[PDB]
Amino acid sequence: GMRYFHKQQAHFWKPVLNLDKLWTLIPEDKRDQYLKSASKETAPVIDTLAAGYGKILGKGRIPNVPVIVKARFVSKLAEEKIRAAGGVVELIA
Amino acid sequence: EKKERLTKEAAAVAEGKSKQDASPKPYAVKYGLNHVVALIENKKAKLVLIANDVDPIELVVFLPALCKKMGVPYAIVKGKARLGTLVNQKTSAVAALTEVRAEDEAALAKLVSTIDANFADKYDEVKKHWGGGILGNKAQAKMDKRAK
Amino acid sequence: GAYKYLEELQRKKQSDVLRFLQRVRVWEYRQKNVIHRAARPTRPDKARRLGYKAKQGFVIYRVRVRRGNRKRPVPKGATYGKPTNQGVNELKYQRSLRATAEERVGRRAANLRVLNSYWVNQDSTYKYFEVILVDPQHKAIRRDARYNWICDPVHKHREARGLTATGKKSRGINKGHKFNNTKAGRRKTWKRQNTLSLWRYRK
Amino acid sequence: LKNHFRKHWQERVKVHFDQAGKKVSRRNARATRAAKIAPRPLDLLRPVVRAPTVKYNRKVRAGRGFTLAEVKAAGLTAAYARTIGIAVDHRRQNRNQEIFDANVQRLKEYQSKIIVFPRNGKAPEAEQVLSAAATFPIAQPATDVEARAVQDNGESAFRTLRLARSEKKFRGIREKRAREK
Amino acid sequence: VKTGIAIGLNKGKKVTSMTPAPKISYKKGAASNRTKFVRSLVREIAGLSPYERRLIDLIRNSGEKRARKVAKKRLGSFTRAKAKVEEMNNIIAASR
RNA sequence: GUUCUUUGUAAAGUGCCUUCGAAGAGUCGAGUUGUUUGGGAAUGCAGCUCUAAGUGGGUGGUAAAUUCCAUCUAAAGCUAA
RNA sequence: GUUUGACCUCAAAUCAGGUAGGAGUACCCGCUGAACUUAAGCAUAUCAAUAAGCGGAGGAAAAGAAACCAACCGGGAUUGCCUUAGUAACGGCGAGUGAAGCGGCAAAAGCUCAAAUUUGAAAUCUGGUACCUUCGGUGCCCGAGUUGUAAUUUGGAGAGGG
């Protein structure tokens, strides 16, 4: 292996959130109404950074509901799976 | 003299009708080192006297060159106690004078011409020509006899 | 002002005028004693910026200190242990010669408090410092609130404890990632982090 | 597998039996300070500031003191503020208008809520509050609304990040090429 | 100016801007008229040091490269050697 | 609270323009030796030698050269919890 | 004038008035500095930047208002706790050793000199002495001091002129 002088584990902070959960970040009160109302003109925006998540992954299926995901990093398959349902991924910093 | 000036000032100004007309414009010598070095670089000084004997000579080594550069007539006087006498101190290490009465203007100008001709025009070369190659009398006799 | 000229001129140490003055003054100081009262500073600008004030209760002592490395005073240079110690004439004495001079001067003048010190000259054998001291029993300094702090008893033998500037430097007291082992006290940090903290409800 | 007990650790052992008594003395010190400080809070108003260190920049957080620009914009001076009960930090600088306006409104609210007594006299009784931190709590700003219209353009953020990475990686080479031109 | 993403040449979230003020502990060491005058006069008095006297000979004989080398050795660093040699070049071009 | 004294037309705060804006040297820094540190082409200290600058100087955890950027302002000092 | 004085430097007094020493040393600031032990025996190493030894203070000491951390949408004196972390890193890469920024918290407090001509007035200060309303005040007299005592200014700024 190689070395790293003055390593500090804040450059590397990048927790991950698979697509399977992705609605735990929506409260329960709001979840079932947004599920039934598959409205493309009005979809729930999900801020993953405020929840404490850097990157989004695509381990599993979500329904075909639109959703606006705000994240710093994503995977190709995650973007694909969200776009299938008809959700955009807005990038943040 | 300061005390009598102050009581006269209080008597004339506090009760009477004037602000600073009681005590007139004073003329005197300037004697502080920093004050005189600041008078130079504003070119208010007409004459400067610099004591030859100072402990830290580095206090005064720069002063002749500075007076030359700013165009001031300087002189090097024998005695800092001699300056302390005329300024009510034990030592002064400098003395300056920047203004005079008209009765003494001509004497001051003649004195400055005298100082220039006798001091600077005579010793303008002294920035070269090192000193202090003297020997004791025994060594001098040795050198003389070995020479002849 | 002339103090500026004095500063810029004292910075030019290898010029002819200053090496002449050095050659004279070192001889004078070597004919005088090792510690002796100076009537006035050789360097008024340096003393002025270090805290000297030309009034009663401010004192200047010229002091002489031998140069070189530290020798351990074991008999016949034998240490009676493992050989890895080192050659004996190669030890360095973490405290500086300025601190040594300050402490000797404060031992001679114990009624005074050592405010500061500064280099004046040196030779192959000796270094020369001027030490600035203060009289806290003098009323002009017990008053005059800019210097009445030296009269409190926590400023006794500042030089011996390492509170002068040379002491702070030799202890390595500054801010940064470089002074991490010695920032609040080397031994303090060592005692702090070689310490087993155990709470009531164990973590 | 690594237990650091080869030194004389048994000399340097601190056990915190003094936990409860220290808590009690801390409370008593707070009470005594309150009595000595009676009409005033025991806490200076601190500003809002955004934390550094990407792990934490999402959060807003309480700082040391307000800037001189913030104080002048509010319309009072640093010394009078320090007497009034406001913390001031001369070395913090303002590069964000959001934080600037937030702390300005903080100072405005504080000025409106307080009541200053004259130096000469009266000193009407005021029923102290103990916590300016509780009276003026920190507010996390609101990024966006709960729900919004979707808008897709087809640049796939994955590819966007890859292109950003690539231009960062191959900046210098292209610059040296255009130099050799 | 920022981009609004977590990577790239200018990464980070976009805030509006402020240019707060120019601090006065940024123009430290800048040359004042008094410093210029004092230092010129002190140079006129004290003159040259021995390694400077060597440098003025070696720039005339040997070129600036030997001067830069020996000045890097007599001083600490190349950054200071450059400025010292520039100073000596200006002294030479003035007196000559 | 109740008087004693109004000290003072004496000090302090504030707006705009204009000219300035001094800021610590055998010190910083570099070489070598010893010691120390987690500090690794060398973390801090001390000894010997060398020794600066002012749009400058220090730091930016891989040694140098070149172009930039960011952040502080040393070599003087006091201070409760 | 081979006289009479001024200054500088160095001394002396049972001169007037004060001051240091020594003890204690649980904690605190430095200096100096081992070996037993553990590593196979052992020079590196570890025990340990420990014990013994020396100097020096206080009720706390030290540190302290950045020649800081950072690379963020930037934080913002120091100290201590939780955590960072038995991690980055060091090491016959073996025995073993080993921090720091961030974050939450306790407590919160900011400031001072030198470098600037008062120059239409050394405006400053110790002591002696007589009174007083005595942790001090007023007057008066020797003195310190211009080789710089006061006011004004400390980089966050600030000064001068208007």
Coordinates of C-alpha atoms in Angstrom, one line a residue, chain C residues 70-171:
Chain C
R70 CA 27.1 21.5 27.3
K71 CA 29.4 19.0 29.0
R72 CA 28.0 16.5 31.5
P73 CA 30.0 16.6 34.7
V74 CA 30.5 12.8 35.1
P75 CA 34.0 11.8 36.3
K76 CA 36.3 11.1 33.4
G77 CA 33.6 11.3 30.8
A78 CA 32.2 7.9 31.7
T79 CA 28.4 7.5 32.0
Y80 CA 28.2 3.9 33.2
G81 CA 25.4 2.7 31.1
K82 CA 24.5 1.7 27.5
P83 CA 27.0 3.1 24.9
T84 CA 24.2 4.8 22.9
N85 CA 24.1 8.1 24.9
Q86 CA 26.5 10.1 22.7
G87 CA 29.9 11.7 22.6
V88 CA 30.0 13.9 25.7
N89 CA 31.0 17.3 24.2
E90 CA 27.9 17.3 21.9
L91 CA 25.1 18.3 24.2
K92 CA 23.1 21.4 23.7
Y93 CA 21.2 22.7 26.7
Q94 CA 17.6 23.3 25.5
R95 CA 17.6 26.7 27.4
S96 CA 19.4 29.5 25.5
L97 CA 22.4 31.5 26.7
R98 CA 20.1 34.5 26.8
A99 CA 18.0 32.7 29.4
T100 CA 21.2 31.7 31.3
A101 CA 22.2 35.3 31.4
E102 CA 18.8 36.5 32.5
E103 CA 18.7 34.0 35.3
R104 CA 22.2 34.8 36.6
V105 CA 21.4 38.5 36.5
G106 CA 18.1 38.0 38.3
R107 CA 20.0 36.0 41.0
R108 CA 22.4 38.9 41.5
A109 CA 19.5 41.3 41.6
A110 CA 16.7 39.4 43.3
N111 CA 14.7 42.5 44.3
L112 CA 14.3 43.4 40.7
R113 CA 12.1 41.5 38.1
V114 CA 13.6 40.6 34.7
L115 CA 11.5 42.2 32.0
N116 CA 13.7 41.4 29.0
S117 CA 17.1 41.1 27.4
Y118 CA 18.9 41.6 24.1
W119 CA 22.1 40.7 22.3
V120 CA 24.8 43.4 22.1
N121 CA 28.0 41.7 21.0
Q122 CA 29.8 38.4 20.9
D123 CA 33.3 36.7 20.6
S124 CA 34.5 33.2 20.1
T125 CA 34.6 32.7 23.9
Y126 CA 31.8 35.0 25.2
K127 CA 28.4 36.3 24.3
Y128 CA 27.2 39.7 25.6
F129 CA 23.6 40.6 26.5
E130 CA 22.0 43.7 28.1
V131 CA 19.2 42.8 30.5
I132 CA 16.3 45.1 31.3
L133 CA 14.9 44.9 34.8
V134 CA 12.2 46.6 36.9
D135 CA 11.9 47.6 40.5
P136 CA 8.4 46.7 41.8
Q137 CA 9.0 48.3 45.2
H138 CA 9.5 51.7 43.5
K139 CA 6.3 53.8 43.8
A140 CA 6.7 55.2 40.2
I141 CA 6.1 51.6 38.9
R142 CA 3.7 50.6 41.6
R143 CA 1.7 53.4 40.2
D144 CA 1.7 54.0 36.5
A145 CA -0.7 51.2 35.6
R146 CA 1.1 50.2 32.4
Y147 CA 3.8 48.4 34.5
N148 CA 2.1 47.7 37.8
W149 CA 1.5 44.1 36.7
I150 CA 5.1 43.2 37.3
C151 CA 4.6 43.9 41.0
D152 CA 2.3 41.1 41.4
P153 CA 3.8 37.9 42.8
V154 CA 3.1 35.6 39.9
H155 CA 5.9 37.4 38.0
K156 CA 8.7 36.3 40.3
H157 CA 11.6 34.8 38.3
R158 CA 9.9 34.8 35.0
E159 CA 13.3 34.1 33.5
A160 CA 13.7 31.0 35.7
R161 CA 10.3 29.6 34.8
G162 CA 10.4 30.4 31.1
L163 CA 8.0 33.3 30.6
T164 CA 10.4 35.7 28.8
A165 CA 10.4 35.6 25.0
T166 CA 13.5 33.3 24.9
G167 CA 11.8 31.1 27.4
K168 CA 8.6 30.8 25.4
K169 CA 10.7 30.1 22.3
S170 CA 12.8 27.4 24.0
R171 CA 9.6 25.8 25.3

